[PDB]
């Protein structure tokens, strides 16, 4: 399964839609819990502080991952962002990957190109086949 977060601009939401894999969204308001394991897809958001903790992870994601039941079933993280942010490029995946035991699977920019959708589909399929 896939768990993704996207802000009001929904660049990440539209990428998960192009993926075609069924996935559940971390709501902009409120908390949720997941049952089946999942991979996390989130964008990166610096906040004037910059310098890559330090954040970069949406607060809704922090709440979702602060859930012990939700964090336990996390398997991997894919971060979105934009290379024009220098060292902060997709650093949210670095934060989630480092602050947990999960690996850093992929990075892409904004809605992702056609190559990103094909890359995440095949990579995520071979990843799930590995867990076994």
């Amino acid at each position: 399964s896939l768990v993704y977060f996207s802000s009001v601009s929904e660049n990440t939401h539209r990428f998960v839609q192009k993926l075609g894999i069924p996935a559940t969204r971390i709501p902009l308001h409120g908390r949720i819990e997941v049952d089946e394991p999942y991979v996390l897809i989130l964008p990166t958001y610096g906040g004037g502080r910059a310098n890559p903790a330090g954040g970069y992870v949406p607060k809704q994601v922090i709440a979702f991952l602060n859930n012990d039941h939700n964090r336990a079933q996390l398997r991997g993280v894919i971060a979105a962002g934009n290379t024009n942010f220098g060292a902060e490029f997709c650093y949210a995946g670095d934060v989630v990957s480092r602050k947990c035991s999960v690996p850093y699977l992929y990075r892409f920019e904004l809605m992702g190109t056609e190559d990103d959708v094909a890359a995440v589909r095949t990579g995520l399929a071979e990843f799930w086949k590995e867990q076994t």
Partner: protein, 283 residues
């Protein structure tokens, strides 16, 4: 008509607060980057390599002068929220900071005669003047959605024709402190392009299907018009040093990113946007 006092305790769009916090939290001035340490690196460049860099920098300065003095301010009446107006004033100011930082680099590294030749070049170069006429036309015209497309294409595409050079020098361990300065600019442009493109999409939702289709045609028409002109601008500058084919890859790479800011899908294939990785490592 009448204006109402801005109440930041009632936001119609949380993105305005998010963008305001990031942009103002990233406040900087050219005096913050110590360009003086680049004096040895600068002296190692050819007269032509110096000339190429100064002209590219002057071209970036014009895009900044245009976006701060005309672009951002012209977006204020098309705001969706009063806080969007406040954000736009910050963009207008930071653009002036961007344009000034190049005069800082020039003051530390270059001579007065070298600077005069650089600014004289920007006045006479038809391609640089052409891209300015194109965006200025839509900034000063009407049609608010077309203005935002032209603005987003400026922030996410037109600049990166010149952003390539400071990244190139950084990949060669030259002008590294200046690259730090330019990196601060690119970080701001990314947010500017994201925000204005985000607002463009918000305005697209308020129009009918016919208008929406007319604007998708417009974006592609203006992108290729600006791109065809940018390739000329790129060729004349980088052909001497043999970087044109890679700068063009970088151009198509960011053109796709500019399209996505406007909610549109990427256009150029992977084999046309595979810029030399050394340049991306500088990013």
């Amino acid at each position: 008509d009448r204006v109402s006092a801005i109440n930041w305790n009632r936001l119609q769009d949380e993105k305005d607060a998010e963008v305001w916090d990031r942009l103002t939290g990233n406040f900087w001035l050219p005096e913050k980057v110590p360009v003086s340490n680049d004096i040895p690196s600068w002296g190692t460049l050819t007269a032509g390599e110096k000339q190429l860099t100064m002209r590219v920098f002057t071209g970036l300065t014009m895009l900044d002068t245009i976006q701060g003095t005309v672009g951002a301010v012209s977006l204020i009446p098309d705001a969706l929220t009063p806080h969007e107006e406040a954000v736009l004033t910050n963009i207008a100011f930071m653009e002036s900071v961007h344009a000034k930082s190049y005069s800082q680099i020039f003051s530390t590294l270059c001579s007065t005669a070298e600077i005069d030749d650089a600014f004289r070049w920007s006045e006479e170069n038809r391609n640089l003047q052409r891209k300015a006429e194109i965006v200025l036309q839509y900034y000063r015209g009407d049609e608010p959605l077309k203005r935002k497309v032209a603005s987003t294409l400026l922030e996410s595409f037109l600049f990166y024709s010149g952003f390539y050079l400071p990244m190139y020098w950084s990949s060669r361990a030259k002008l590294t402190n200046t690259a730090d300065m330019i990196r601060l600019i690119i970080r701001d442009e990314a947010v500017h392009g994201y925000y204005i493109g985000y607002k463009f999409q918000r305005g697209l939702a308020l129009v009918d299907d016919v208008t929406r289709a007319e604007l998708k045609d417009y974006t592609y028409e203006l992108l290729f018009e600006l791109y065809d002109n940018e390739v000329e601008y790129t060729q004349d500058l980088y052909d001497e040093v043999g970087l044109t084919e890679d700068v063009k890859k970088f151009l198509r790479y960011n053109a796709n990113k500019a399209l996505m800011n406007l909610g549109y899908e990427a256009l150029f294939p992977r084999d046309e946007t595979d810029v030399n990785p050394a340049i991306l490592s500088a990013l």
